[PDB]
């Protein structure tokens, strides 16, 4: 299956694991990046309260402002995933 | 120069124009997507108050939750730019 590589995290270990799990479910179900992102965002809103934002892609850079302990940036296979709550 | 194509906006005309202008300045100065994004985010924080988030790239999808009237998604040349304030 897909290899998870966490690049930058400000987030508990448990929540990082839930992020990888949610992204793995999303990739199993969906092929389009915005749909993958939507699944992850919506699940995190339910599991860890709103308001989350998710970007999924192979080529992008970002500059965001996040709530402390609510940020992860990771690869699952070849796709990069940014998931965070705003500050 | 670069062609601006606004794909989806929830934002005043004036602010949409400032977004395109800021992105044009950013692309003139920087080549790396995260630096482009940082310039735009920081300028919008100053011009239109915090808190903005910016993604710049050629391949990504997103699912975010934004404040009403504070969202734009547009291309400048071949790069896509998402700029918004969180809800």
């Amino acid at each position: 299956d897909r290899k998870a590589v966490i690049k930058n995290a400000d987030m508990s270990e448990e929540m990082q694991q839930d992020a990888v799990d949610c992204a793995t479910q999303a990739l199993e179900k969906y092929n389009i990046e915005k749909d993958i992102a939507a699944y992850i965002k919506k699940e995190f809103d339910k599991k860890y309260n709103p308001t989350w934002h998710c970007i999924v892609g192979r080529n992008f850079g970002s500059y965001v402002t996040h709530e402390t302990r609510h940020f992860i940036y990771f690869y699952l296979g070849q796709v990069a995933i940014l998931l965070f709550k705003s500050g | 120069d670069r062609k601006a194509v606004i794909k989806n906006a929830d934002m005043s005309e004036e602010m949409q124009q400032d977004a395109v202008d800021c992105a044009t300045q950013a692309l003139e100065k920087y080549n790396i997507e995260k630096d482009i994004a940082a310039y735009i985010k920081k300028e919008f924080d100053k011009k239109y108050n915090p808190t903005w988030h910016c993604i710049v790239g050629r391949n990504f999808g997103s699912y975010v939750t934004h404040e009403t009237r504070h969202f734009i998604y547009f291309y400048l040349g071949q790069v896509a730019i998402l700029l918004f304030k969180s809800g």
Binding site: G61, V64, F84 | -
Partner: peptide, 11 residues
């Protein structure tokens, strides 16, 4: 408390 973060894909 809020923190700025930047990310950049490898590709």
């Amino acid at each position: 408390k809020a923190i700025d973060a930047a990310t950049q894909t490898e590709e």
